[PDB]
């Protein structure tokens, strides 16, 4: 650990610092199903069609933060997955048990569910989420027994909520309010806490699998560092050109890397099992990048970028390795858009609005090939 | 003897002076022409 610069760091020096190893899981002691710490999953109320999501389909990002039930398509979505964090860093993948304090994140969004007195249910951002707000316990009956909860035990623990087969109520640890709907009358039902509530309250748990919890992470952080740079790209313009303005150049081009291996398409050698398990994998990507909006955001980065006619001129409005990085990062871009709408139907017929404003750009040298190879995947 | 005597050089930084210590250090170039000021000025160099 590295005292040279003001935050803290870890670097490999012939220093030595001090270590300790603290456990979270065992694999071996997991049980199948069996609700373990730090899972990611699916809240579902009715017949197993509703699911607790935020409408993140329509973009706003004070839409973001209202909570509501949702059917359809949702719960193949990656808008409905939350992540479950215990409240205790040691053993925090263990079993979890009923009455069991937690914090519900919003994989997507990255935010915390919490509830203040007079705007119900919020999600709110990681500084200001402080346990007390987004503190949530499953409990197995509605009866409030109020038991309390026993001695923090160092290990696995007992497996206790299954997977689909158990019914649990979601309570606030400090009010007690049940997690209820208001029943207002793509079912879009609003979720409220409520002292009582009603009978049919119980929530199931649906397990997402890796692939689904790694493509919404991965949705967040793109999400994160493409608005940063759309941000950081809107102050260099506006005749408002500083370096105060802070411009991910390095971490844009390795995020965008980082997609285009992502959605590589499957190697041709492979045998057949293996490049079918690799294209489904490639198309659920493809279509959670396509349910999150990721398209559009792609488009915004190039059409920001396109505003500067050549490297040298960004290079003039930004700086200098801006302007060597601008060619790289449109090429960039655009291999990752061909990627993203490659062999999905789907994804095409929803791009299909966008073809006159991709042939505009057709006679720029610097993307002629990359929308040609867009608009020869599209047609 | 020498891979001994390196490996202890290096857990011990210190052992390398002032300079190629790190966190402030000049430079062997910086520091042999330091001490030829040094020894151009009578002062810094004797007891005085």
Wanted: one cysteine or more.
């Amino acid at each position: 650990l590295s005292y040279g610069n003001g935050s803290l760091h870890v670097d490999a020096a012939f220093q030595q610092t001090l270590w300790s190893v603290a456990p979270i899981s065992s694999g071996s002691e997991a049980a199948q199903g069996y609700l373990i710490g730090g899972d990611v999953l699916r809240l579902l109320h009715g017949h197993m069609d509703e699911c607790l999501t935020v409408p993140s389909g329509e973009h706003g990002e004070e839409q973001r933060r209202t909570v509501h039930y949702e059917g359809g398509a949702v719960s193949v979505h990656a808008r409905s997955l939350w992540r479950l964090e215990t409240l205790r860093v040691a053993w925090s993948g263990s079993h979890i048990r009923w009455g069991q304090p937690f914090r519900l994140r919003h994989v997507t969004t990255g935010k915390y569910l919490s509830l203040m007195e007079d705007k119900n249910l919020l999600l709110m951002d990681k500084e200001k989420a402080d346990v007390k707000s987004t503190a949530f316990t499953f409990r197995s009956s509605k009866e409030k027994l109020d038991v309390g909860v026993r001695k923090e035990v160092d290990g696995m623990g007992t497996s206790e909520i299954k997977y689909g087969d158990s019914v649990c109520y979601i309570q606030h640890v400090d009010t007690g309010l049940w997690l209820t709907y208001q029943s207002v009358d793509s079912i879009q039902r609003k979720a409220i806490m409520h002292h009582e509530g009603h009978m049919d309250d119980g929530i199931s748990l649906s397990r997402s699998q890796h692939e689904e919890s790694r493509t919404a992470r991965v949705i967040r952080s793109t999400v994160f560092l493409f608005n940063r740079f759309i941000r950081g790209l809107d102050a260099l313009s506006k005749k408002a050109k500083a370096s105060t303005v802070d411009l991910p150049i390095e971490s844009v081009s390795l995020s965008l890397q980082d997609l285009i291996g992502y959605f590589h398409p499957p190697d041709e050698h492979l045998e057949h099992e293996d490049k079918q398990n690799r294209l489904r994998a490639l198309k659920n990507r493809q279509n959670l990048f396509q349910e999150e909006g990721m398209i559009n955001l792609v488009l915004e980065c190039i059409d920001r970028l396109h505003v500067y006619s050549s490297a040298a001129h960004f290079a003039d409005v930004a700086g200098r390795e801006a302007g060597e990085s601008w060619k790289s990062i449109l090429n960039s871009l655009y291999e990752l858009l061909a990627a993203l709408i490659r062999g999905n139907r789907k994804n095409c017929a929803q791009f299909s609005g966008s073809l006159d404003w991709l042939i505009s750009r057709l006679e720029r040298l610097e993307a002629s090939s990359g929308i040609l190879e867009v608009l020869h995947c599209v047609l | 003897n020498a891979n001994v005597v390196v490996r202890l050089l290096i857990r011990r930084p210190e052992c390398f002076g002032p300079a190629l210590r790190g966190e402030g250090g000049n430079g062997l170039l910086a520091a042999m022409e330091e001490a030829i000021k040094i020894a151009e000025d009578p002062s810094r160099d004797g007891p005085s």
